[PDB]
Paper text:
Chemerin functions as both an adipocytokine and a chemotactic factor and plays key roles in adipogenesis and inflammation. The chemerin receptors chemokine-like receptor 1 (CMKLR1) and G protein-coupled receptor 1 (GPR1), play crucial roles in regulating obesity, inflammation, and cancer, highlighting their potential as therapeutic targets. Although both receptors recognize the same ligand, chemerin, and share high sequence identity, they exhibit distinct signaling properties and biological functions. CMKLR1 is the canonical chemerin receptor that mediates both G protein and arrestin signaling, while GPR1 exhibits weak G protein signaling but strong arrestin-dependent and -independent internalization.
The wild-type CMKLR1 or the C-terminally truncated GPR1 was co-expressed with chemerin and Gi1 protein, then the complexes were purified and analyzed using cryo-electron microscopy (cryo-EM) single-particle analysis, yielding density maps at overall resolutions of 3.5 Å and 3.6 Å for the chemerin–CMKLR1–Gi1 and chemerin–GPR1–Gi1 complexes, respectively. In the chemerin–CMKLR1–Gi1 structure, the long axis of the chemerin core is perpendicular to the membrane plane, while in the chemerin–GPR1–Gi1 structure, the ligand core shifts towards the second extracellular loop (ECL2) with its long axis forming a 45° angle with the membrane plane. Although the cryo-EM map of the chemerin–CMKLR1–Gi1 complex does not allow modeling of the receptor N-terminus, our functional data imply the importance of this region in mediating the chemerin-induced CMKLR1 activation as well. It was observed that truncating over 20 residues in the receptor N-terminus led to an over 260-fold reduction of chemerin potency in triggering Gi activation. In the Gi1-bound CMKLR1 and GPR1 structures, the residue F156 of chemerin resides at the bottom of the ligand-binding pocket and forms hydrophobic contacts with the tyrosine residue at position 6.51 in both of the receptors (CMKLR1, Y2766.51; GPR1, Y2626.51; superscripts indicate Ballesteros-Weinstein nomenclature). Compared to the LRH7-C2-bound CMKLR1 structure, this interaction in the chemerin–CMKLR1–Gi1 and chemerin–GPR1–Gi1 complexes induces a rearrangement of the hydrophobic core formed by Y2766.51, H2776.52, and W2736.48 in the receptor, resulting in a shift of the “toggle switch” W2736.48 and triggering an outward movement of the receptor helix VI on the intracellular side. In addition to the rearrangement of the conserved “toggle switch” residue W2736.48 within the CW6.48xP motif, the residue F6.44 in P5.50I3.40F6.44 motif displays rotamer conformational change upon CMKLR1 activation, triggering the signaling cascade to induce the shift of helix VI and VII. The outward movement of the receptor helix VI in the Gi1-bound CMKLR1 and GPR1 generates a cavity on the receptor intracellular surface for G protein binding.
Author numbering:
A (entry chain C): 9 to 62
B (entry chain A): 6 to 41, 44 to 55, 183 to 232, 241 to 287, 295 to 354
C (entry chain R): 35 to 195, 211 to 330
D (entry chain B): 6 to 340
E (entry chain L): 22 to 37, 43 to 56, 61 to 89, 93 to 105, 109 to 117, 131 to 157
The structure:
Amino acid sequence: IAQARKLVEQLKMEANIDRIKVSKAAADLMAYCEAHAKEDPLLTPVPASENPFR
Amino acid sequence: SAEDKAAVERSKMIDRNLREDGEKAAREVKLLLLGASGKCTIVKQMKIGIVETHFTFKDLHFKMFDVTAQRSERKKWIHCFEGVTAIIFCVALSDYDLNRMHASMKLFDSICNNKWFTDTSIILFLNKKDLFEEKIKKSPLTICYTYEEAAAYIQCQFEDLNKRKDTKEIYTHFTCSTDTKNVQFVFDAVTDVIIKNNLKDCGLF
Amino acid sequence: EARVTRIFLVVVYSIVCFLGILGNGLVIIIATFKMKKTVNMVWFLNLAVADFLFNVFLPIHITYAAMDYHWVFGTAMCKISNFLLIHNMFTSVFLLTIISSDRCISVLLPVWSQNHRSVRLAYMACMVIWVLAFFLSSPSLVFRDTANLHGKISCFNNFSLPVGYSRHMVVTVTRFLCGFLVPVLIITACYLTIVCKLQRNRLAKTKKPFKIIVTIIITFFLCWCPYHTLNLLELHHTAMPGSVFSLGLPLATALAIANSCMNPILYVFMGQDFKKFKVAL
Amino acid sequence: QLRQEAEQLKNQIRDARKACADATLSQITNNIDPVGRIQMRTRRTLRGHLAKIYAMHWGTDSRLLVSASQDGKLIIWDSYTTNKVHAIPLRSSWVMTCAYAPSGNYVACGGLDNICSIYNLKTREGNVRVSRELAGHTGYLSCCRFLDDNQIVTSSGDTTCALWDIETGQQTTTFTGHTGDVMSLSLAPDTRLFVSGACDASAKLWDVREGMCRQTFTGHESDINAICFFPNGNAFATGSDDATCRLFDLRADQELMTYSHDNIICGITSVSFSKSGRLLLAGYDDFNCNVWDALKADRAGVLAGHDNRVSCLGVTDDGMAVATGSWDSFLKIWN
Amino acid sequence: LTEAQRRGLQVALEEFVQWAFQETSVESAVPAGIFVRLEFKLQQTSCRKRDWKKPECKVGRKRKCLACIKLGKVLGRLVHCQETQCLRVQRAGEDPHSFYFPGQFAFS
């Protein structure tokens, strides 16, 4: 019964997490991607002059 | 080209060492021990994580990998044993009166039908023959499902679980008290497997 | 008609020539890059490169034959081209023999083959094979002299119009022996031993190795018997008539050069590497 | 009693999660510019392994990388010039994980021997020597990641994650909340939190210092194989054997978007993110890997250069290139 | 010999000027019954090609022509009045097997 009590306590502890709406998190990831979009060689191609793999 | 000369030379010597190590490793024959009897005390009692055992018979260096200590899911680490030359599966004839025999049959069927062992040979060891010799005299084989007929019937049922009869061959042996017959059987099986691999490499078939 | 046989035969000369050239190029390309490194890799690579050199030096003789045997390319060009052709063909024969012997040892002696097979040994065997072929092909570069004979200059073997001589008996005989007799005997013995081992304990299920062995032996004999026996028969050329030496000898050349193109079909293209390559394509 | 209360609390959690959702990532990112076709070529290949490659890890300087193979080799390559910087033999050839220290002074390995081996690279004599051996896990170590020169985090097949002090060699913290074999590990950029997915189709987030789980996600219907934190650190992507990969948010505590296609039936072995996280790299079992648009669930591209299944892949810290290893004994660098 | 060459010369003399020639004397002779390689000088006569049918005609060109003659063929017929043009046929031999150099019909 110890395992069941521990699982119940863990689930009760996890039930008390203050969450936020999906829209705000989506906006945060969108803003991060937009901000760091210009520093992604995979997304934006890099000229071969500065490319270490040439 | 002042600092790259030393870096390139290091790569060449490391590559040479890698080639030597690969050539040395390709000279070894590998066996994977399985069972439900899992420890395979019959083959681990010779005079010589997972357990690695080395032994030389007739100028052949056999490596044996025993995986009893791996009690987790089998499907998440069995794919690491693609390159094993053969699989030694141990099953006890004396466990028929203990479900245990059914578990052994299920394990053998799961191992033999695995996609990773399509062309991997399996050597089946029917251990504890001596105890089963008189254990049958007190309890019949009907509970699980002369010693000769019962042993042959168990062996043929174990061989029936195979589905890829054309891509692999199963070797069935009755474990004896002496250790001079199991070594010979294993050597013959691995010699046959080596012949198969050499013929496949040569491209004849 | 001017020459029906020559016109009919130069076509197949050219056809087998570029067929073998393309096959050797393909097998070299696949073996060098997209295949692992083993003893069989060394054997196949060296055989392929030898056959490729043979088939790239073949067109010179093909064009020489295409112009009614008129060696107009030079006065000493056949002193090297024929030597290189002989070296390549004898190297191919020696590697076929050593491949058959290696297969026989690997089948009959699994433990020894597992314990005593390394790339260094294969490289040493290849090097000594090339060295042995060089010594036997050395007389070729010293025994080509061009004669006119009222126009249509052609180069022959014997001498110019107590050294630098062979009596036509210590050269023709030895290339016959070491080029046909020992190789076919070794190959036949090895393959018959392999077949007996396979059939003794029913090792094989499909009849692929039997067909491969029988076709290898048949093609080797058919390709290397007529040319060698005609070269040996050249000693008593004053007794036999000139019709055979004028007709069968080009046919013997065609049969001999067919083997250099048929070897990749029988040896490498039946392996798993070619199956993987064709699956990827 | 206890079971009924647990079921009621789980139902309440599910209801709260459903009520907290007001929209989905698909509609919010409907008006964004599509990525298009991300076509990468193999700018560099490394061929020094004679067995299957099971693990790889990019260096902090994005110039040296490490690879683990079943032949018993841990090879450190110079990515720029294909130079083999180092080769470490392993006591056990069965290795399925490897880690590279952020300082670059140490390397890690582990496998079926349920022992984590830490080797010192920057030695006075220049020869790599074993610096630490950790043996406290019942099952095989599936993944290991470095935090610093002193602490490491490992996960094993006995449903247990551990935090090891390399100087002492003992288990400072233990996590035993998973009911299945943990298969992947990934740490937050600040090395304070880490998510781990197990074979019971659940991914749990753990605190390095506190030592207890806070959030658990059971979106997948199959055993999780790969996990990777988002570059932001408030989200992570999990790839499993159900031919689909999902993205979860710590703050949202639930699903955001899933990436799957009809033609994909094989499982997923490795998952990684780029610098901005706009596109995701997913290695599959169908002999090639895919690049997905993380914000639109669209296949941006396909990289197909491996003769066998892709086992591991990693993106450099500066995002200059990606490295993919496979069972065909070759590792390729795509850019 | 000379009779055969002269007989063959007259036949080819009708083709080769609207007039013909007739044999007057012999300058050179000779080598076997298959090829003679004879040469002689000719001169314009009174009778022409139409009258060349009968030798009995009324019979100043210093030609001194050379015309190799083959019997048995028509392979060799010198026309200039270079020497190399006859060496290709000035053999009178047999099957080329007689002039055999070991190695022509081979790559060895």
